[PDB]
Amino acid sequence: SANNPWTGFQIFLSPYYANEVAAAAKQITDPTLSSKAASVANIPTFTWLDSVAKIPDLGTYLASASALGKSTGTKQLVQIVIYDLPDRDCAAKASNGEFSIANNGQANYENYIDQIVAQIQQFPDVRVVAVIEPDSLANLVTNLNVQKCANAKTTYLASVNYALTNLAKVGVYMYMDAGHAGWLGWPANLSPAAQLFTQVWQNAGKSPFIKGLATNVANYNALQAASPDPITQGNPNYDEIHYINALAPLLQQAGWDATFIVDQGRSGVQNIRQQWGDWCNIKGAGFGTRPTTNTGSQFIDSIVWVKPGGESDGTSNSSSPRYDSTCSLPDAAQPAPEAGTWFQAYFQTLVSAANPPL
Structure with missing residues (x-):
């Protein structure tokens, strides 16, 4: 599109990830690998506002960015x-979500959005790009047979709508999460996905700030694969570029000339999964293509690092109340700590296996 949110802007680097990376790099014993690891702090990542407790951090990042710009x-x-x-x-x-539908979830989520908007409103000289709710809308395409998803459908739609509608009022550029090629990129899922995303875009007023969709968030797919990963058998859309090429025209027909961003933060190593749906701490992952607007596709505004590589996807301890057995599969690195917390061994391998090399 004409307006790529990133062009002409300097991305504010997360100080939290910078601190995690700096602390991680001094534990890496090999001096050469340690310095490659340290340099990861210079690679832009997304900050996850996974709880209300993270909102004050957003405020500090906006204010810091404003001062750095000047x-x-x-x-x-x-x-x-x-x-x-x-x-x-x-x-x-x-x-690991703090809100539940049964306990005023929608109102509580609206208040979470309101607090975020109230921060963003104070810093108009800083641009914000937001990925909207990974692992949400995609479930409403393929997983309505999951009763928790069926029962969450109206809340997910209303809450995502509230986020889009109100973040647009402060000029936030937004990409709705849209799963990945092995989720919504199956040819048979493309049209139901397009219908859902278009309805969501319509309900939020078709705001020009709703730029499009984010794919491969927290996942491991190639953007452009040299050869299909065996996990993809049966799906001609075996990488993100095939998925995006197939989905984008369906959105364009609805009057939404949508563009895309693609997570590549853990995509450096392909052919590491037993089944495509295995998502938790996949063993042997490497850092992938660094963020860039040189994406190789008319539809893609940026390659991005959304999931911060090195933060665990979930614990492998079956005694944790937050335990998901996906995190104990043979292709999951174990033992693994609780979701979001630092996983030092995994980070060191992400560095060692980086492709392109760091």
Whole structure:
């Protein structure tokens, strides 16, 4: 499209990920690998607003970005993930969301959005790009047979709508999560997905700030695969570019000339999964293509690092109340700590296996 949110902006680097990476790099004993690891702090990632407790951090990042812009002569851009739906991750065996549909989930989520908007409103000289609710709408395409998802459908739609409608009022550029090629990219899922995303876009007023969709968030697919990963058998859309090429025209027909961003933060190593749906701490993952607007596709505004590589996807301890057995599969790195917390061994392998090399 004409307006790529990233062009002409300097991405604000997460200080939290920078601190995690710096602390991680000094534990890496090999001096050469340690310095490659340290350099990861210079690679832009998305900050996950996975709870209300993260909202004050958003405020600090906006204010810091505003001051950095002025100190360096640049316009700054802060990258966030909106990730706090009630009954979050409805098809998972476990979720870490603080809100539940049964306990005023929708009102509580609206207040979470209101607090985010109230921060963003104070810093108009900082641009914000937001990924909207990973692991949400995609479940409403393929997983309505999951009773928790069926029961969450109206709340997911209403809450995502509230986020889109109100973040648009403060000029946030938004990409709705849209799963990945092995979820919604199956040819038979493309039209139901397009119908859902278009309805969501319509309900939120077709705001031009709703730029399109984010794919491969927290996943491991190739953007452009040299040869199909065996996990993809039966799906001609075996990588993200095939998925996006197939989905984009369906959105365009509805009057939404949507563009896309693609997570590649853990895509450096292909052919590491036994089944395509295995998502938790996949062993042997490497850092992938660094974020860039040089995407190789008319439809793709940026390759991004949404999931911050090195933060666990979930614990492998079956005694945890948050335990999801996906995290104990043979292709999941174990033992693994609780979701979101630092997983040092996994980070070190992400560095060692980075492709392109760091």
